[PDB]
């Protein structure tokens, strides 16, 4: 059964709630982004209206085969009426096509649902500037002060400089990048751009990328592995055994692998600056774990909430334990006492 923090009061609406069968009283299902924990349940057999971004609707039609007649894409930054209720979709700074949803309830209450997001000061100048928000349904993934990580720009600077140095030292090195979902495409696109290569990948991953409206994509990706020196593999294969096996397949073109695992936060973030990051190495294989996050750090989250000044916060992540819930509630009260709302 659908949990309460996926229901929008005063409406017929749910958010990210496709795994519960037919939800009682739901007239429109919203989908914030195409990540499996959120889309779980959708298929060619779904026959209710789904509301989402254009990019999410391209993925629903081509990857999950949802029929066209039930996909309702909305433009961003544009007031739209859905089943008698005004809504707006805003960029969530998460993966491609990911949105936050503003709902203007018939009684005057305004609700913001962040979906999954990486808070940024740019959001302070969106359509959020113009009005009060009563209720915030918040992505609390990293809601504790131990969760620190660098900017995405610093992480990409490290990746590009690391890959360009290695391949200039050894023109017979191959670069490999791990993936298991959409998001984090800048990692492998930026490395291929500095090296003058396309990114090589499976037909299934190429198909997925072609749904994303990324400009000049035909220029940056390929299914011809032999033409590429930056290869994408499943995240599960980014280990010494899986990389050894891959290097065999390349027919003696290469004699070294430099591999990247974009993770979120890891405990090594408590101690190590991005500059000082080192790989794990076995023979001619090196693996770098790089802290490329598509979720808010603690400080980014706190800044956003202290700017928005919501009357009530509903967490949507870390809700299953009492200890997590009590910790989050304590930080929400701190933020409110410090800022004065
Ligand atoms: Ni996500």
Task: At 259, give phi and psi (nearest 5°).
Answer: -120, 145
Measured CA distances, 103 to 4, 306, 310 (Å)? 17, 20, 14
Which tokens go with 175? 């670069």
Note whether 151 and 122 are within 8 A (CB). no
String of DSSP letters for 115-150? -S----GGGGGSTTTTS--SEEEE--TT-STT----
181 C-alpha to ligand 1 centroid (Å): 9
94 C-alpha to ligand 1 centroid (Å): 7
Domains and CATH numbers, the chain: 1-147+296-341 (3.60.15.10), 148-295 (3.40.50.12650)
171 C-alpha to ligand 1 centroid (Å): 36
Q: Report the residue numbers after which the chain has a gap, meaning the C atom sits over 2.5 angstroms from the next written residue's N, or none.
A: none
89 C-alpha to ligand 1 centroid (Å): 16
262 C-alpha to ligand 1 centroid (Å): 14
Residue whose structure tokens are 């290469």: 254
* Longest CA–CA separation in the chain, Å: 68
Write the Ramachandran bin of 331: left for phi over 0, alpha for psi from -120 to 50, otherwise beta.
Answer: alpha
38 C-alpha to ligand 1 centroid (Å): 7
74 C-alpha to ligand 1 centroid (Å): 19
32 C-alpha to ligand 1 centroid (Å): 9
Note whether 315 and 328 are within 8 A (CB). yes
267 C-alpha to ligand 1 centroid (Å): 21
Which tokens go with 152? 């995405």
Task: At 306, give phi and psi (nearest 5°).
Answer: -65, -30
What's the burial of 252, exposed, middle or buried (CB within 10 Å: 0-12/13-18/19+)? exposed
String of DSSP letters for 28-87? EEE-----HHHHTT-STT--S-EEE-HHHHHHHHHHS---GGGEEE--TT--EEETTEEE
Closest CA to 328 of 183, 139, 113, 60: 139
Helix (H) or strand (E) run with residue 152 in it: helix 152-169
Residue whose structure tokens are 């490329």: 292
Label residues 145-158 b or e (16+ Cβ within 10 Å = b).
Answer: eebebbebeebbeb
What's the burial of 131, exposed, middle or buried (CB within 10 Å: 0-12/13-18/19+)? exposed
Distance CA(92)–CA(141), nearest Å, equals 14
Residue whose structure tokens are 């709902």: 103
Distance CA(103)–CA(125), nearest Å, equals 18
Closest CA to 341 of 305, 295, 297: 305
Distance CA(39)–CA(16), nearest Å, equals 6
Length of the chain equals 341
Note whether 145 and 317 are within 8 A (CB). no
Q: How far is CA 227 from the centre of its chain?
A: 29
Experimental method: X-ray
String of DSSP letters for 10-25? TTTEEES--SSSS-TT
């Amino acid at each position: 059964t659908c949990p309460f923090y996926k229901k929008i009061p005063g409406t017929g609406f749910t958010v990210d709630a496709f795994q519960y069968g037919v939800v009682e009283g739901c007239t429109a299902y919203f989908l914030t982004h195409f990540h499996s924990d959120h889309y779980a349940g959708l298929s060619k057999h779904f026959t209710f209206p789904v509301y989402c971004s254009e990019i999410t609707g391209n993925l629903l039609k081509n990857k999950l085969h949802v029929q066209e007649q039930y996909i309702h894409p909305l433009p961003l930054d544009t007031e739209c009426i859905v089943n008698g209720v005004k809504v707006v979709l805003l960029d969530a700074n998460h993966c491609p096509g990911a949105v936050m949803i503003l709902f203007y309830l018939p009684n005057g209450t305004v609700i913001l649902h962040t979906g999954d997001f990486r808070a940024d000061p740019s959001m302070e100048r969106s359509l959020l500037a113009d009005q009060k928000v009563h209720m915030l349904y918040l992505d609390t993934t990293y809601c504790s002060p131990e969760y620190t990580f660098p900017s995405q720009q610093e992480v990409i600077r490290f990746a590009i400089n690391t890959a360009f140095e290695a391949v200039t030292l050894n023109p017979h090195a191959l670069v490999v990048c791990g993936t298991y979902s959409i998001g984090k495409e800048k990692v492998f696109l930026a490395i291929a751009d500095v090296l003058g290569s396309k990114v090589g990948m499976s037909q299934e991953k190429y198909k997925t990328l072609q749904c994303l409206n990324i400009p000049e994509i035909n220029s940056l990706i390929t299914t011809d592995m032999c033409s590429s020196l930056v290869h994408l593999l499943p995240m599960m294969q980014i280990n010494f055994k899986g990389l050894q096996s891959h290097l065999k397949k390349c027919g003696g073109k290469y004699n070294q692998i430099l591999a990247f695992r974009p993770t979120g936060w890891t405990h090594s973030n408590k101690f190590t600056r991005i500059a000082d990051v080192i790989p794990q190495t076995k023979g001619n294989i090196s693996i770098y774990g790089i802290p490329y996050s598509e979720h808010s750090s603690y400080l980014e989250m706190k800044r956003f909430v202290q700017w928005l000044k919501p009357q009530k916060i509903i967490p949507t992540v870390n809700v299953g334990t009492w200890k997590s819930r009590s910790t989050m509630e304590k930080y929400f009260r701190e933020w409110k006492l410090e800022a004065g709302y």
